[PDB]
Design a protein around this ligand. Structure first.
Ligand SMILES: [Cl-]
Ligand SMILES: [Cl-]
Ligand SMILES: [Cl-]
Lengths: 456, 456, 456
């Protein structure tokens, strides 16, 4: 059950009650399509059905040629000021998958995989480097072409095939064309992993055969659409009648730990004289999850995806913080953790739509209201930072911008408190601290009060 | 007619003459596809045409199953330093559509919609919460399957269908497969809204039936491609022989108000001694539109899309500013509005391609020129901030970077003026104001001149 | 051969050995599809095969109508703090292609192109403005419809076509539908250029016919997937039985010059007292390439794509810097170039995965290790900035974040040196310089030491 608290003192809100699903690692499987090596199409027969087969077989050959050009390359991909995103490290997302892909280029490795998938369409193969991977055969065009299409190709006659075969071949070949299509506009690396790359049935089957926990299997199976988005498909090799590409699947090593989302908005003084005001904004907005005695913090919105009450995040775009980082929500002046803020003189109106309400920073001459669809305006905000819950409210207007609020069910709590911006003397307030903290601002103020003390 | 003015004094340019098309709200419609509930396919007949129908019917079932898994989840999506983007608020883009989607999950609501679309393919339905929406039936697979495909499915015989039916069913079923395909790689929420989701005919028809102004209807109909980009499709429910998804359409409450685009570039002193220079840059670049007595300001480029002379913007990514914000273009030291700037010591060369010309910030040893395709170089820029119009110029080169200029027709005006950076004493100039303003810089300078005055 | 050096003194690493492929210009070609102008479909025959042709011909007409609406619009597109991206200029990516597209709207220009492609499918046309472009015909639906489909359309009888024709027409028409599909969700401008827009064969052929250097031809042909990603397709006109769109291809004027990638990470003091530490970070991370006596610098990761040992970059998102910018890697206090840094007090742990290793910034209580897959943990990092090569290491863990390292072959060199953060007195260290440099920090320190000197 989702709950939420608004802190009037620091113009921020925390949404609690969420459960974690953090991608901590990677699982790499090798997906294969058995191809028929065919060059020639010996047939002078100008029959229309033969022509259609020839045309479809021509697309097949071009796809193979196109993929061979892609194989020649080494796979690679590249994955505000009020957020702490600039503090993040830089990972290499497909480094694990690529490492597997490189092994597949080694001679004998290809033939090794083909041997394992001879009788079955699912097997585990020991690679020459000493790594085991789940290998899968999802399509056998080699079988179909050699069994259904050989007499119309391998011989001058060329016994004209039935129309149903012409249709059937186009259906089966289509998947190869679409896979090639995706790789060719994505430089051999795609994400999310499409159903062409891996069907719902194949993915669900792959998950079940993944030697992971029953909880992980259940988790991934109930959230396939999220798993696809956190996965990569990496074109590897097309060699000796087999196309192989590496599918890089998320590994969720952290599950069902409490998560909370922190929303922040500018807190300024509200003096009538334009420009005589000072502002303060908590910059530690984003998702937080308890994780192994510490806290995983995700500054950027793209990193986390919410499904009902479960949060799917990627640890690559996170910081590991002391659990005392949560103290900034209860006591921003706590002596255990230096809470991060930014200062400014720019008092501009804006709103933050939270999980269960809306934070409104209303300043100057801005019209700020909250409304119900039936009644209309039910609350007019005064200057300063305020909050309203989603219960009874459908929209919020700040200036010329209309925000719809989330209609998620859950209780909000308004925690009254003196706006902390009122505690500072504007005469010595540093309003140029773009990336700062509580203590760093205090330090600046003490220096300013010192240079004044020297003068006095 | 587009015009443009360059202000030499502040190294910036304003492009006028544009008309507004601002998305201010949302309209939510419910799109439905009538599905045939079929499980069994009773037929032992091994006929090739039967096999093709069976295979296509199998794709149909997998799509339905796949969509049912998507329905189980709650829809969600996540929508530099020289820009003021960090000042923006945070909205919830699909909060309105999702609110409608949740209503559709309530029992009876599904049957209520199906009743309205019984005789017609277009109707308005009162939802149990008390909200009316345009509901539409775009595909009836239930009818086709039950009328054309029942004897080959519901019975052991299984009278073999004609080849044209096999083709026809694949054609009709394809749309369902593609819709499912899009939702499955987008976690149930897609944008822009594709033609699979809503065809050009259906969208145009929907717009005409939308009880909006004739101007809005005309506007949306002439710019369908833009409307699609500003729309969301939200997978809702697949229950009791009907697939329903919510299409969230833009509502343009502001039309044909004057808009202007502000371009900015660094203004530095040009002393010969490397590193002895100070820089200044207007940070209020972006789109501006008159709006309800105020000005809607769009700092980020992605927010606005230009079609000829009309600007399509989203108010969610805007600030509402006093109209006096425009005074920064005429008099940056005006006493009515504190114009936003940033300071630095980093004098690096760069160019900004405007609507009707190019701003060039040329510093140090950088080669800066403007050229015509026929003649070649026609102007060599000196150090400082300068400008050239697109009339007679095709390209501009700054260092190793070649920019093509926009060949839009329109008059440019060069407004001569002393570069304002020359007004500051470098000895007391604060060059560490990453996010500042005219008065904030003055305030810093007065403090510096005070600590000096105390010493003296 | 790729090599790498880590500088302990400045917590940074440089990866050498790369070769350049910089997009410096644009080549614009005009792609055409000959369309059949057909309105009526005179046939009362209710034959199933006729019905299928009618339905497919209906899609053809809707595509044409849809494209005509797109033609009505003017094409346009819109193309952290630890990066210097905010220093970049603003170009207009499709300004060159659009300029060509505008010429195509002029009367006679359309007929001029159609005349050139009358006998051949490849020609060079002089446009009325005085610009020559490679024009190409990739599909002739006009021929097919008028030759194979006229009697079933132009007459009440309507001699029922064979089933193979029904299939064939759907195959040929499909490309038109997909092109229309892409343009309609991309407002007439697509990137990367798909195989629908331009097939692998057509693109390779176009490249060979492009009057460029043999090196460029070889370069583009071996990296087609990259070329597609650096290309635009711009819907222009559909008028007088011909659809024409402009394909904007990359021009690589700089090839095989040495490139290097600079990786940076925070360097902080490691005092036991939490918050008593000061930090310093090189902000000039990104790709560097020698270019015409200067250096092209690419701050943003998206700008450059690496294929094996060759770097594909776009000069539009670059700065042109003096070659002395490289001195920051050898001597950050060099008197020839003012190396860019940022200061802070926030000592947060993070890692940067490099080309041939990993930089680890470990601070506070963070667990920082490096591991082999077989052995496990082989190195535990102490507080400070350290480095490990990819040789023998597969993963690196910083806190709750596991990074896979790149398994690229190449030698790393560890350049020992005193961390430069140790050279600063914390009592006068400016930790609020979000965008600064070596000299700017020194200047601040000298001022602080002056106000102290006055007091003394
Ligand atoms: Cl909204
Ligand atoms: Cl350009
Ligand atoms: Cl990783």
């Amino acid at each position: 059950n989702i709950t939420e608290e608004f802190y009037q003192s620091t113009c921020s809100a925390v949404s609690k009650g969420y459960l974690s699903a953090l991608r901590t690692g990677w699982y790499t499987s090798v997906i294969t399509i058995e191809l028929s090596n065919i060059k020639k199409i010996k047939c002078n027969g100008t029959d229309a059905k033969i022509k259609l087969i020839k045309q479809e077989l021509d697309k097949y050959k071009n796809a193979v040629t196109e993929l061979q050009l892609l194989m020649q390359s080494t796979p690679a991909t590249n994955n505000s000021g009020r957020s702490l995103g600039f503090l993040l490290g830089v990972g290499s997302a497909i480094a694990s998958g690529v490492a597997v892909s490189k092994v597949l280029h080694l001679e004998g490795e290809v033939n090794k995989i083909k041997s394992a998938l001879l009788s079955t369409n699912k097997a585990v193969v020991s690679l020459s480097n000493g790594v085991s991977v789940l290998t899968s055969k999802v399509l056998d065009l080699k079988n179909y072409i050699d069994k259904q299409l050989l007499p119309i190709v391998n011989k001058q006659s060329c016994s004209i095939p039935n129309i149903e075969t012409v249709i059937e071949f186009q259906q089966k070949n289509n998947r190869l064309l679409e896979i090639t299509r995706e790789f060719s506009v994505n430089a051999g690396v795609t994400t999310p992993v499409s159903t062409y790359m891996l069907t719902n049935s194949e993915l669900l089957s792959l998950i079940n055969d993944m030697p992971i926990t029953n909880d992980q299997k259940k988790l991934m199976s109930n959230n396939v659409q999220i798993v696809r988005q956190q996965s990569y498909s990496i074109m590897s090799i097309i060699k000796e009648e087999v196309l192989a590409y590496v599918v890089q699947l998320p590994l969720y090593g952290v599950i069902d730990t409490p998560c909370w989302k922190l929303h922040t908005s500018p807190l300024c003084t509200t003096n009538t004289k334009e420009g005589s005001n000072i502002c303060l904004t908590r910059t530690d907005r984003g998702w937080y999850c308890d994780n192994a005695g510490s806290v995983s913090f995700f500054p950027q919105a793209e990193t986390c995806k919410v499904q009902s009450n479960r949060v799917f995040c990627d640890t690559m775009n996170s910081l590991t913080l002391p659990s005392e980082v949560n103290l900034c929500n209860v006591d921003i002046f706590n002596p255990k953790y230096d809470c991060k803020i930014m200062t400014s003189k720019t008092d501009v109106s804006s709103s933050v739509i939270t999980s269960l309400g809306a934070i409104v920073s209303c300043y100057g001459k801005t019209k700020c209201t909250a409304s119900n669809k039936n009644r209309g305006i039910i609350k007019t905000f005064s200057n300063g930072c305020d909050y309203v819950s989603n219960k009874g409210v459908d929209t919020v207007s700040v200036g010329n911008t209309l925000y719809y609020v989330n209609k998620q069910e859950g209780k909000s709590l308004y925690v009254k408190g003196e706006p902390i911006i009122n505690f500072y003397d504007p005469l010595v307030f540093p309003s140029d601290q773009f990336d700062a903290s509580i203590s760093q601002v205090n330090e600046k103020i003490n220096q300013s009060l010192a240079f004044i003390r020297k003068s006095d």
